[PDB]
Amino acid sequence: QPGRFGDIQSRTVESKDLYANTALKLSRPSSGTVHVPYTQTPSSFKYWIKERGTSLNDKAPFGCVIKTNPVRAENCAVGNIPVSMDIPDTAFTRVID
Amino acid sequence: EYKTVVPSPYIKCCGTSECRSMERPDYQCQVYTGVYPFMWGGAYCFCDT
Amino acid sequence: SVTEHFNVYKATKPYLAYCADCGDGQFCYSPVAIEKIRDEASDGMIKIQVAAQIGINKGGTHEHNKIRYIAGHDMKEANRDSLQVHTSGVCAIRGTMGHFIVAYCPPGDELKVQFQDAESHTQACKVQYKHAPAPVGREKFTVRPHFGIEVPCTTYQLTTAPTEEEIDMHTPPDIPDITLLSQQSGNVKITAGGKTIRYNCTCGSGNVGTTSSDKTINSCKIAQCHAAVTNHDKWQYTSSFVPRADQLSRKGKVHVPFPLTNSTCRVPVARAPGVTYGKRELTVKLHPDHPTLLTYRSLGADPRPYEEWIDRYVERT
Amino acid sequence: PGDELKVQFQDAESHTQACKVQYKHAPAPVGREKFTVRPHFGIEVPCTTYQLT
Amino acid sequence: CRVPVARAPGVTYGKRELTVKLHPDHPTLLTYRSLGADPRPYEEWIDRYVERT
Amino acid sequence: SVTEHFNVYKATKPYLAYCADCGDGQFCYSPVAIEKIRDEASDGMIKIQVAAQ
Numbered sequence A: 001q002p003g004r005f006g007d008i009q010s011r012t013v014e015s016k017d018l019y020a021n022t023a024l025k026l027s028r029p030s031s032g033t034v035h036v037p038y039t040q041t042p043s044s045f046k047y048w049i050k051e052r053g054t055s056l057n058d059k060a061p062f063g064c065v066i067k068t069n070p071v072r073a074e075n076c077a078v079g080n081i082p083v084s085m086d087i088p089d090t091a092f093t094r095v096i097d
Numbered sequence B: 001e002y003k004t005v006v007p008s009p010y011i012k013c014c015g016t017s018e019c020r021s022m023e024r025p026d027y028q029c030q031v032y033t034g035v036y037p038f039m040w041g042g043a044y045c046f047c048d049t
Numbered sequence C: 001s002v003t004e005h006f007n008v009y010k011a012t013k014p015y016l017a018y019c020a021d022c023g024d025g026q027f028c029y030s031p032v033a034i035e036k037i038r039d040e041a042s043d044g045m046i047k048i049q050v051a052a053q054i055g056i057n058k059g060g061t062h063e064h065n066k067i068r069y070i071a072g073h074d075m076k077e078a079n080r081d082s083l084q085v086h087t088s089g090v091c092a093i094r095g096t097m098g099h100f101i102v103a104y105c106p107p108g109d110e111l112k113v114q115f116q117d118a119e120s121h122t123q124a125c126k127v128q129y130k131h132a133p134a135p136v137g138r139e140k141f142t143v144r145p146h147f148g149i150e151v152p153c154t155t156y157q158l159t160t161a162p163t164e165e166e167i168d169m170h171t172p173p174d175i176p177d178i179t180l181l182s183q184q185s186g187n188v189k190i191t192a193g194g195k196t197i198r199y200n201c202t203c204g205s206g207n208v209g210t211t212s213s214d215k216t217i218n219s220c221k222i223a224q225c226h227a228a229v230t231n232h233d234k235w236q237y238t239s240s241f242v243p244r245a246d247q248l249s250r251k252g253k254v255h256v257p258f259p260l261t262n263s264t265c266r267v268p269v270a271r272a273p274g275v276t277y278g279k280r281e282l283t284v285k286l287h288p289d290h291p292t293l294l295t296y297r298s299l300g301a302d303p304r305p306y307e308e309w310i311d312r313y314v315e316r317t
Numbered sequence D: 001p002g003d004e005l006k007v008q009f010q011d012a013e014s015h016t017q018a019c020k021v022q023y024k025h026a027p028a029p030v031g032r033e034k035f036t037v038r039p040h041f042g043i044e045v046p047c048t049t050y051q052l053t
Numbered sequence E: 001c002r003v004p005v006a007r008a009p010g011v012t013y014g015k016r017e018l019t020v021k022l023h024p025d026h027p028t029l030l031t032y033r034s035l036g037a038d039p040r041p042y043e044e045w046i047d048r049y050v051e052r053t
Numbered sequence F: 001s002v003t004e005h006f007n008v009y010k011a012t013k014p015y016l017a018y019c020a021d022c023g024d025g026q027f028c029y030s031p032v033a034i035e036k037i038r039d040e041a042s043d044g045m046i047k048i049q050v051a052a053q
């Protein structure tokens, strides 16, 4: 949509076939100047630098910190992990000594 | 972040020209009727219409 | 500055656009002309494309303190000193070459350039631009403090190597001029001056002549013959305020300089709050000077987030 | 805009002189939009000015 | 004087109502009134991206 | 400017210090610097203590 996020959409970083739908429209020059006038809505990606909210780490539920680059949710506190082990007989001490 | 490229306008003071209708992603073209340019040193196209 | 980087500007000349406001509030045909500016860094380092080539003398050599422009299809020069930009306050220029200026300007809602003329006549070009970068961190500060921490934000380079993006340039179309005609007594006299001049005289004669010398008709009046300088040699930027020469393809290329770089910045820290404990709560006392930003959340399954910009001495619980 | 008037010039002996009065300057815009500089494409709207004669 | 024009807003037709989506950059007016025997006029200085009915 | 009053200024020389902001955005060891300024006055008066004799 021309003004909300994603008005210029490409399938990958190096490709073709853009999806520009920014509502471009031309008018005619006024009387005696050489100029081309037009009108379009501004960028959605420039609205989405300041209209975006805070990050999740200010209001994530269980006090977990959210990093970003290999997107994480590190140091939660929920649930419980079960374990099961098998230690050999040489680790014990016999009841003789 | 998009970038609307706009070339120089083409103008010809003897007759007419026409559209092209290419396949650029948001191509938009139109030819306008009798104009009168007024560049720096007086009028440009040396006629009136 | 490697002097071989300006060899792309070897066949280039500036032009005259239609900067429609010049400070005095009326239109011009100024040398300087804010074509388009673009901001894609994060420390607020804008980059301006103007028409008057800087840092190059009339011959085409890289001289630093010189700026060549155009004035009535004639090259001139002017001084690199007394060139400054300012939005709402005077701001520094950090590196510039060719058509491109790299500024550092404070927030405002306009943008102008100016440089002193060779006849000392300050000529300018302003255009409405809303400049307001997001200040890094979580305070609202104005100057650098001498004590703080480091917060990242990108910027541009200062190198002038040719990097992968360009603007096109073409043969310049025409310059019409009514100076070149004169009517003494029943005779138009097309003076040449050293340039090929086209006419369109329609009395009874031919209407095509690429006459590189003086030529008379002895039959026309001055309201019938029309002069136009043609067939130039130096390319110029295909501006949207200058008409296209013909409907052919591109002919030239010059790189746009200053590619991108991440960087850091220093941010002030707010002083430590005063606390008061006592029953399942805390009463905090806040001392801000410039508006900071308090926030908190719970640790259970249901957080209750809260945020507020604190300005003066208040207290919360 | 700004709410004080100050006019000044250099003296012949190179000393800045000025006088400053308290006056509320905030001109109302002509039309229906608050704009700063004139655009290169728009409408003409009647108004008054001071002629330079 | 010369004055800029605002951009054409994107409308959306619904049941006995009208959703308009405004994109100003410098502040503009927005008035309307009914055409019957009882107008209920409106006025507001729209500054940012907003949406009205 | 009493000639008997300036006679303390004999062994005193101005210095250069670490200024935070030169006025362009970056730091420099500037000759002019502010150590601390005061308004123990009750109006808009200052006694700027510059690091320059």
Ligand SMILES: *[C@@H]1O[C@H](CO)[C@@H](O[C@@H]2O[C@H](CO)[C@@H](O[C@@H]3O[C@H](CO[C@H]4O[C@H](CO)[C@@H](O)[C@H](O)[C@@H]4O)[C@@H](O)[C@H](O[C@H]4O[C@H](CO)[C@@H](O)[C@H](O)[C@@H]4O)[C@@H]3O)[C@H](O)[C@H]2NC(C)=O)[C@H](O)[C@H]1NC(C)=O
Binding pocket: B014, B015, B016, B046, B047, C200, C201, C202, C207, C208
């Ligand atoms: C030197 O300067 C002179 C002065 O301008 C130029 O001469 C003009 O050249 C144009 C070329 O287009 C001429 O215009 C053409 O006139 C033809 C006949 O004229 C009659 O019809 C026109 C309108 O049709 C009337 O204005 C005129 O009075 C006559 O009644 C027309 O057949 C042409 O029609 C073209 O345009 C129409 C749109 O109006 C299209 O529908 C047609 O298909 C067709 O494409 C055209 O109007 C003009 O008459 C010439 N003389 C004058 C005095 O202007 C020279 O060209 C210039 N020298 C050079 C080298 O360029």
Ligand SMILES: *[C@@H]1O[C@H](CO)[C@@H](O[C@@H]2O[C@H](CO)[C@@H](O[C@@H]3O[C@H](CO[C@H]4O[C@H](CO)[C@@H](O)[C@H](O)[C@@H]4O)[C@@H](O)[C@H](O[C@H]4O[C@H](CO)[C@@H](O)[C@H](O)[C@@H]4O)[C@@H]3O)[C@H](O)[C@H]2NC(C)=O)[C@H](O)[C@H]1NC(C)=O
Binding pocket: A013, A069, C260, C261, C262
């Ligand atoms: C400021 O600091 C940031 C820090 O992140 C820099 O951002 C990095 O920029 C580089 C630019 O080259 C990015 O590298 C490119 O990433 C593209 C997309 O990323 C995907 O792939 C990479 C690698 O596979 C993954 O790490 C990532 O998670 C994504 O899955 C790739 O498509 C690019 O690949 C190209 O090169 C490789 C060789 O390395 C080829 O095999 C490919 O075929 C292709 O040609 C490239 O790797 C990097 O991802 C960015 N980091 C991020 C996003 O975290 C900024 O660049 C820096 N600012 C400046 C001005 O430099």
